[PDB]
Symmetry: D2
Subunit: 244 residues, 4 copies
């Protein structure tokens, strides 16, 4: 089924970040060739606290990057909404300055509060399997487990956990950041994810426009493969596969 | 600079295998949506070798593609040469894929026989593309014979495991003076994209597509994956963040 | 160095589970050859409940071990606390392993219930060691409650997969202010050794030893593996050579 | 069983290189604590090849070990044969490790020259052990020449990455009719243990030990790792649990 969040459907399963591109011209070009329908951005890092873009053609997913506690995240979200730049909110509460991995307690807390306030909520979380279900039980509109640490470029580090999260989900699962190249974006969709959220892997490339194109194709390719029923892994029964 | 083998250029970097699809209609549609320019097939298992088996490449306009018949079935260089000669005599050979399997369990290639068959076929005027392992120096040895491309396998034929040794593949691509096309052992788009991301000039696929529940859709998936991986390669992907933890000896 | 938890030291950094061995004779021999000083056991499945279940500690001279009863079987913090109280009242509790599984399929831990149970048991005077996931910040949240050790799993219980996310484990061990012991998901010596090579203070295993065709021999192997891994960590292993290939962006 | 090569038995399954230690004193104690019975060394780089070069075997009591000189440095089969002959004339050769590197960047072996050198040395009466890649059929071609052991690399020499293709190594070990010893590329105990867990008859290492901050302690760690891995192989480890997720097609 077409990616649907909070009752709204999207033709593109690729969520694109904005803000760290070399220039607005390159950013606008990248956004276009990506064909993304949902654009995400760090609210804090903006004048109100992305130009040359007709926001009327996109759904805005501002995030609370910079927040250390649920309270700071709620403050940022309320401002985004009041500023008219929020169709849905990406709850992001980083709890480690070194790894930049999310704080589960604060994410759980902020998600519950923002749901009570009427927001369409999408929490950025780790690949902790039960935690993901806990977030869903609050009533969030999507769950966004990270493939790996933000900006690591390592791709998905724990396919097994991601598989558990996707298979138990009752709302869309979108792999968020930690992506480095098309192979990672494709793998996420191959595992059954409903979409992928990318930012630095594209804006940080030597040629952002080309990479944005590559990611668009990779997400499509991975989704098609998932739907097509790929071949299984051949069983050889050697020592490298204990129990086989 | 698109894929160029033996002086001929190809718009598509995806080489598609034919012959094991559920039907000729599905195969035709798969070939079309893949946009592949080079079609590969095991000639030994076709009507031309014996009229007890249907022929592949059916319903296909052979004039719109470059044919890469392979010597699957050969156990020795001599058997490979026999197959190649017959394929050429039958008008189904533009280039030959030298495949000499030396293990019935893993289906991995025999290096000695592959080197032998490759040298012989080059002497006979063929455009030669050897299927080989990811043994780095072996790849250079093959190039030194004068082959027109080197086709290291990502993993064993039909394993569906993708690239098992990206480091070795990286060494092979970085030292090559002719195109490098990752051949089989591919299971999904992520693997095809990765090959291109490492710098491969192309990917050769068969069972991954023909064996999927929906071959036509997977054919389209692989086409997109190869294009995506190649684009990423050209675009200069971001590096890996260095955290300096014990999981990375040397930070 | 020497493993120290709650101020108590142990010569062996290998923690061993009891209760699932083929027999008590084998369990006794496996425990002995392992040289482990800390034994864990699921109180919920023992005789100290309603119906007479087996006494997993039968034939063992308990004066030779520090007891770490666990709350396996608990679905909520409340049930975990009750199990811990039971172990304490039965005189079989030196420290408590808090385990609250939240997924019947993966058997992965419930972070909310684990946080809750840990805080409650600390309030009740126990030396607390929570079993947790490899969620990095979660590990710190547990430490910040005042627990005496953190026990992140290498992979799901009984998976035999070994360490699935060494990076996350590395962050957990490097930020920790209490001992970090990799718990379960271990399949063979290579995994136990890796855990120690990453800087873990110890490893806790159960079925990888009890479920092997030769439990006693595997106990010996794990003993040697944990020792080897630790020595390597201390010896300063060689770095990864960099070739500058596309496979290393 | 016991590691047997050319009819000769060895108590230790750990083969150790010499000549790259911080000092001969450290080398001696490292070799001692490793309990290795077979020592390898690069003849082309020591005194017997050029008086201007030192003797990597100083202070060692060679009568306590079986000598496995290697042809490291040889770029062709001819050079390898020459090095082997020298080692023999110097009375420093019980078995010969054939090593013909064909890439200066990766240091990976030349299959053609290795095949050629092995054949020639066998003809000249040597007990031959070729260093090779993890090319599965290549390993068998070498065996079929009549060699006494096959030594596939886990990864490139000095890479410290451990075993990069366990599947291929598994095929090599399962098809072999002679001992298979994983040679170099090893970085820590987890790798040595894994090699044995896959069923290797032994492991050969050098810089992972000689290059550690504490070579003596690392030598001990590797001794324990090889023992642990072997014990696990024999003990019958637990299988990999299957969850039937998309991550396992």
């Amino acid at each position: 089924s077409m990616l649907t969040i909070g009752g709204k459907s999207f033709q593109s399963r690729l969520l694109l970040g904005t803000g760290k591109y070399p220039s607005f011209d390159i950013q606008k070009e990248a956004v276009a060739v990506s064909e993304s329908d949902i654009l995400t951005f760090a609210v804090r890092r903006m004048n109100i606290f992305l130009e040359q873009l007709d926001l009327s053609k996109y759904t805005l997913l501002p995030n609370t990057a910079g927040a250390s506690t649920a309270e700071e995240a709620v403050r940022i979200a309320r401002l985004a909404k009041a500023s008219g730049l929020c169709d849905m909110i990406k709850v992001e509460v980083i709890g480690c300055s070194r790894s930049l991995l999310p704080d589960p307690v604060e994410t759980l807390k902020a998600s519950e509060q923002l749901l009570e306030e009427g927001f369409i909520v999408l929490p950025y979380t780790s690949d902790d399997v039960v935690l993901a279900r806990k977030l869903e039980e609050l009533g969030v509109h999507a769950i966004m487990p990270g493939a790996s640490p933000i900006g690591s470029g390592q791709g998905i580090l724990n396919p097994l956990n991601l598989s558990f999260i996707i298979e138990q989900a009752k709302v869309p699962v979108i792999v968020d950041a930690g992506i480095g190249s098309p192979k990672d974006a494709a793998y996420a969709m191959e595992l059954g994810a409903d979409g992928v959220l990318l930012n630095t892997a594209v804006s940080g490339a030597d040629d952002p426009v080309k990479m944005a194109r590559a990611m668009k194709l990779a997400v499509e390719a991975g989704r098609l493969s998932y739907e097509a029923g790929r071949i299984p892994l051949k069983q050889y029964g050697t020592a490298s596969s204990p129990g086989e």
